[PDB]
Each structure stands twice: as C-alpha cells, then as structure tokens.
Amino acid sequence: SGFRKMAFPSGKVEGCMVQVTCGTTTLNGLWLDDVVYCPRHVICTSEDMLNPNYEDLLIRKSNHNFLVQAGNVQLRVIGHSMQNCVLKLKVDTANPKTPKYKFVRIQPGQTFSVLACYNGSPSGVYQCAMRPNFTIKGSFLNGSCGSVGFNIDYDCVSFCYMHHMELPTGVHAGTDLEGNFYGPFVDRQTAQAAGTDTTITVNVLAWLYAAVINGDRWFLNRFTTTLNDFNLVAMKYNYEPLTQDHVDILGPLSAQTGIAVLDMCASLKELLQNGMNGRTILGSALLEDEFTPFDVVRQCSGVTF
Amino acid sequence: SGFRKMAFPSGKVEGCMVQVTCGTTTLNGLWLDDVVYCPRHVICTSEDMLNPNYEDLLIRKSNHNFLVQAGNVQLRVIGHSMQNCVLKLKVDTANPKTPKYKFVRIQPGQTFSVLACYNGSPSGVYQCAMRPNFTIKGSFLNGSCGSVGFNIDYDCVSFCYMHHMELPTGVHAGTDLEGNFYGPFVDRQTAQAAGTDTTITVNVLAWLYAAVINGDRWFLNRFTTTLNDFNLVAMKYNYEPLTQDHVDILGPLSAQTGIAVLDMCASLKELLQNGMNGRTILGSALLEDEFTPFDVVRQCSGVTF
Ligand SMILES: CC[C@@]1(C(=O)Nc2cncc3ccccc23)CNS(=O)(=O)c2ccc(Cl)cc21
Numbered sequence A, B: 001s002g003f004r005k006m007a008f009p010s011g012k013v014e015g016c017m018v019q020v021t022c023g024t025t026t027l028n029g030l031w032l033d034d035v036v037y038c039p040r041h042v043i044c045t046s047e048d049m050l051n052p053n054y055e056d057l058l059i060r061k062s063n064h065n066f067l068v069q070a071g072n073v074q075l076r077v078i079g080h081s082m083q084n085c086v087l088k089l090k091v092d093t094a095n096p097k098t099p100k101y102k103f104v105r106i107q108p109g110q111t112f113s114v115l116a117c118y119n120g121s122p123s124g125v126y127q128c129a130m131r132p133n134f135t136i137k138g139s140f141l142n143g144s145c146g147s148v149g150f151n152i153d154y155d156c157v158s159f160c161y162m163h164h165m166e167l168p169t170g171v172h173a174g175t176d177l178e179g180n181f182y183g184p185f186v187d188r189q190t191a192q193a194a195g196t197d198t199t200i201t202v203n204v205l206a207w208l209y210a211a212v213i214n215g216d217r218w219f220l221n222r223f224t225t226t227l228n229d230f231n232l233v234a235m236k237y238n239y240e241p242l243t244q245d246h247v248d249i250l251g252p253l254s255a256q257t258g259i260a261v262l263d264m265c266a267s268l269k270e271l272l273q274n275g276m277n278g279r280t281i282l283g284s285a286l287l288e289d290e291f292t293p294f295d296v297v298r299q300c301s302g303v304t305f
C-alpha cells in the first residue's frame, strides 16, 4: 500500500556529474566516456546573452578556457564541438563510472527524474512530467543549469533532458541530450512565454486507476461515455484530447481493476463538472497528472533495477 | 524559483543494498563495512508471526542458514547477533562502497528519503515525514521490508529508518537502525492500530514561509495571535500543538520574510477557517506538512519575491 511520487534511483547519474567553468560562468556537465555535455550558454556572458552568435564565440575559445572538474580532481579538455544548444567537451579521461546509456527525446505527458545539481554536486532528485506546453514545473535555483532528466529501463539510463533556463512564470525549459530544445524556446535573453497549459488526461485516468487499486472507490459511478462525448467535456476543462492509443495503453489497468476505460472516463467527467466535494483521491484535493500508465503499473507491481 | 518535494540522491545508499534470504523468507539488508542489517522477522515464518520468541528462533540458526547476496556475488556470513528488532549479520567481506554514515533516531515531524527495494534491488526513491503518530505514509509492496530511510547532509548519510511492517490502514511502521521501533508497535502480527493522526503545524508554517519567499502573499492577513489562542484553534482542526521550540526554529524564516511567527500563525488560523477558496499555495489545494523548517531553508533562496 501507499502512493507517492517516486523517482528512479539517481546513483547511475550521480557518477556522471561534473562542474563546467568558462570564465565567470559555472554550470553542470554530464560526463559520459571521454565527453562532457553541458549547455552551450556556458561560453556566454550576461552581455552576450541578448543576441549571441555561438559559432563566433566558440571559434575564439581554446580548450583550457573550459575548466571541467570531477569531484576534487581536475579534468583536461582536449576538444570542443557543438551540437545544436549543447556544447560537447572532449576530455582526456574516460569516466570510469559511465553507465549503460541512451539519449532519448521524450513526448509531452511522459515523466522523468531530475537530478538537480549545483557546481557538479548532486543535491536532490525529484519526479516531473514534460508538460503539454513543453515546459517542466521543476525546482531550480541559479547554477542548476546542466542538471539532467532521466529514466531507467532495466540497467539502461535513458537521458531525456538538460536544464537550460527558467521562464518568468517560474516554469523551466531545457533540451534533449542532442541540444534540441523542448518547445518553442531559444537559448538567449528574450521575451519568452510559457504557452497555455493543459492537464494530461491519460495520466489523470492512470492516477484514478491507482486510487482504485489502493482502495479509493467513492468517485466511481455506474455510468460510461463515448470517446467523443468525453473529449468535448475534456476540451472545456483544458484537458488534453484522449486518443484511441491512450485508451489501449490503459488496458492493463482496466483489466486489473475491472473498470473499462470509458467507465473511468465517466467518473472523471463527473469529477470535472462537480468537483471533489470536500473529499480527496490518494491524499490529494487536485487531480494528479504526473503519473503515466506505466508509472502506475511499475509502482503497483514492484519493478526493480 | 520553484517548489517541489525533493529527495536526497540515493546513490550512496544504493551501494549498501543486499538481499537477505532465510529459508522461505526474502527481504532487504543494509551492508555497511562487514555488517548486514535487516529486520529480525527474517527468521520468522507466517505461523511464528503471531507470538514469536525471537531469541529461541535465533539460537536454532547457524551462519549458513542465512544467504546474503550482493548483486550477482554471494556473501559469506560469519556471525549473527540481534539488537532489539534488527538482526546484525557479520559478513566476511567489507562493503567497498560503504559511505560516510551515522545512525540517527529522528523525531516526529522530521523528514527523510526512502530507497524502496525488492530482493536487494533498488526500485525507487521518495521523500516522506515521520508522522505525529509514528507511522509513515510510504509506498511499499510485500518484499520491501528492510528498505531504509536516510538524510544525506554534507557527505554523511544519516540512517534513520528500516521498514518492518504495514498496518491495516495502509500506513507503515519501522525501526531506527538500532532495532528500536518508532511508536507503540511490535514486530508481531497482532491487533495494532495506527493512532489518530495530526497535521504537523510547524511544517505547515514553514511551507507557508516558503510560499511567501516564492512570491505568494494572498493567505496573509493583518491579524496576529497569542501562542495559546492559536493552539486551541489548531487542536480543533487536528493540528499538532505548536510549542515554544517550534516558534524559535521558525526564527530564521521569520526574519527573512519579515513576518513574525505568531503573525504567520494567524494567517494559518484564517486558512483553517475559510479554506483555500479555489486558490492554491505553492501549487497545492491542501496545506502541505512534509517540509520541515530546515528543508525550506535548504531548498529556497535567500532572495524573497
Ligand atoms: C512479515 C512482514 C509483515 C508485513 O507487514 N509486511 C509488509 C511490509 N511492508 C509492506 C507490505 C505490503 C503488503 C504486504 C506486506 C507488507 C507481514 N504482515 S504481518 O501483519 O504479519 C507483519 C507484522 C509485523 C511485522 Cl514487523 C511484519 C509483518
């Protein structure tokens, strides 16, 4: 029993965190084999950040201008290339603690763990989701840049995110490990705004299935709905459109609890129109949307790495 | 900016997780130097659990009756003593990954990270608090016994908990790393009931101070209160009695925001009265009580908004 927001064990990722210093700027780097990966905004000053020319700024820096530090040991940079918005620093020494890894670009609604670091030193780990508006509601202070988002599948760490900047509304924006931003964001000092967010419908549904598994059945009713009638209501409450793929993915949960996906959709429809009414599902007065159908099956089965 | 429930990086604790097997039973163990620590109910059967005589059951066991397994390698037990409710297995190999550690007994209202394991294999990490009724609302399935609660302050891992059992209401009971239970609980399958829980007042207060630091002030009012008048009202909403120690501990936060502790108490008194009224403090429709005054100072910046 029990339902908590859980993150993957951060150990494999902790062994990859280094501190990258370039002039006055100091952020975090990801050391895998003989390459350190970090935001390309490390070469930038606060003057350069308005309209930067990253290729012109990189052609001027030599290897020793970048001080990479792994714990108490210094690392020797022997090369520097750039891939989109990530700077790839070839180092002399291969990381002996390199885990089995992959670089993956995740889709909105998919969750990941964030190992928040400051000066190459891990300080915390938390779980979060890629919002429909490509932002992440993370917890970051200055100097957290270069912190990574990951998921472990068996013994393989799948790197899916690197922190770059925080938006004016308190939300965060970063890139996949290939430098490609998540969303309509750019790495520079400009008027950037987070779009209108939506609730991840397939995750709320999965979280209600976890509540039924954990003994909460008060929100269930005898009624069901058509996928179309559900989507019209969902659209009115800023919910993401539920697709036939979403329905199929909730299949294992539907079979385990004994409540059809469109039966559970009707419970959610009535929770949107009428509310909680002083009650809580899984200890929450809000409908939680950062638990994917896989996350629920993992926590309510016991998958080990 | 940003406020999330954060857990400590689990890496230092991952390297200590072994699998303890004694006959048909298999739970988790904590391997520090040449000692493996695990629940003493590993020696028990489901028959023995009603009224076990642990001394009589241990004297019938030889070192080979225990199979400790560290990853793919088998460990050789060369001793077996018992300390309260924890079984201490002397092994023939010291853990090369033993971190700098301490054993600490925490008090209610304090928070810690939990590395949930199954068959010595870490599967997830989450943050939780020692409830006023000595239980923890964790996320544990069968076979998670022996999972530990920790706090990593600086480079030292402070071990404060070991999972022993799950009560009928779905809450969890465990011991400190010396085998001493938290609460009026016994490692016996008897009619044990979790006491009436209360909200941790000093943590809700700290969480409101973090909201003020992060820019929210809607909940504040012009009223103030006496410590006594606050406690009478608090006890009505099942809130923990606020003590003069609690007030002092909130001192640094009181100075940083510029809102006296009894001023913040009167904002909470009103919040308990009218409720949220469709609004949220730090992204929550409930008053969060699993952030200690120390957690808030740790996570939040010194720059108030
Ligand atoms: C022998 C362990 C056991 C237990 O609670 N196991 C568990 C621990 N944590 C999560 C669980 C989730 C589901 C199933 C069991 C869980 C078994 N139940 S009992 O009442 O006999 C019992 C009584 C006292 C002690 Cl200290 C242990 C135990």
Ligand SMILES: [Cl-]
Pocket: B105, B106, B107, B108, B110
């Ligand atoms: Cl304490």
